């Protein structure tokens, strides 16, 4: 009813843990709205569950925003991740290409040369490719969306058009994923 099956199931990337993938995009207003609720949910999630946030690209212009996510993670600035949403949606900053992104990161204390180097790195390119591979295998059709255990997919729309309802379904799917 409030979720769909992923067939064939996706293989697990975290032994002994149930993976929850939140597929998101920085440009998605609902991803921005749900982000603090996801961060709060992650604080109380079961210890055998791991949350991964996976940036997606439905058109090629979204690929720099995938690179931005993995660049901030590689620079060990996860504090800047929620601030990207705020900068784009509340402060109306146009953080849509590498140049604007690097200027914004530099204003946040990131060395510009390191940002630019990491943004172009093979490691980031591989993570972006993997993010799009995961979205393809999970049969993504919008954001925000949640894949649970590599086997089930839900979203606020599927869970009765409600953010908290989506996370309640995620909780139900976690129990199901343990069998």
Numbering used by the authors: 1 to 179
List sentences quoted exactly from the publication behind this structure:
In Gram‐negative species, these bonds are introduced by the Dsb enzyme family, with DsbA acting as the primary thiol oxidase. B. pertussis' single DsbA (BperDsbA) (Heras et al., 2009) and DsbC (BperDsbC) enzymes have been shown to be essential for both the formation and stabilization of the pertussis toxin (PTX), a major virulence factor in B. pertussis infection (Scanlon et al., 2019; Stenson & Weiss, 2002). Notably, it contains a highly destabilizing catalytic Dsb, resulting in one of the most oxidizing redox potentials recorded for a DsbA enzyme. Functionally, BperDsbA shows limited substrate promiscuity and selectively catalyzes the oxidative folding of a pertussis toxin‐derived peptide, supporting a model of substrate specialization.
The structure of BperDsbA was solved to a resolution of 1.65 Å using molecular replacement and refined to R‐factor and R‐free values of 16.87% and 20.16%, respectively. The asymmetric unit contains two symmetrically independent monomers, both encompassing residues 1–179, which superimpose with a root‐mean‐square deviation (RMSD) of 0.432 Å across 179 equivalent Cα atoms. BperDsbA shares the canonical DsbA‐like architecture (Martin et al., 1993) with a TRX‐like core fold defined by the conserved motifs β₂α₁β₃ (residues 19–63) and β₄β₅α₇ (residues 130–179) separated by an alpha helical insertion domain. This insertion includes a three‐helix bundle (α₂, α₃, α₄; residues 64–111) and two additional helices (α₅ and α₆; residues 112–129). The active site includes conserved catalytic residues, with the CXXC motif (C28P29H30C31) located at the tip of α₁ (Quan et al., 2007) and the proline loop (G142T143P144) bridging α6 and β4 (inset) (Ren et al., 2009). Although the protein was oxidized prior to crystallization, the structure revealed BperDsbA in a reduced form, likely due to radiation damage. In this reduced state, hydrogen‐bond contacts were observed between the sulfur atom of Cys28 and the main‐chain nitrogen atoms of Pro29, His30, and Cys31 within the CPHC motif. Additionally, Cys28 forms hydrogen bonds with both the main‐chain carbonyl and side‐chain hydroxyl group of Thr144, a residue located in the cis‐proline loop (G142T143P144). Furthermore, BperDsbA exhibits an unusual surface electrostatic distribution, characterized by a positive patch directly above the active site and a negatively charged groove below.
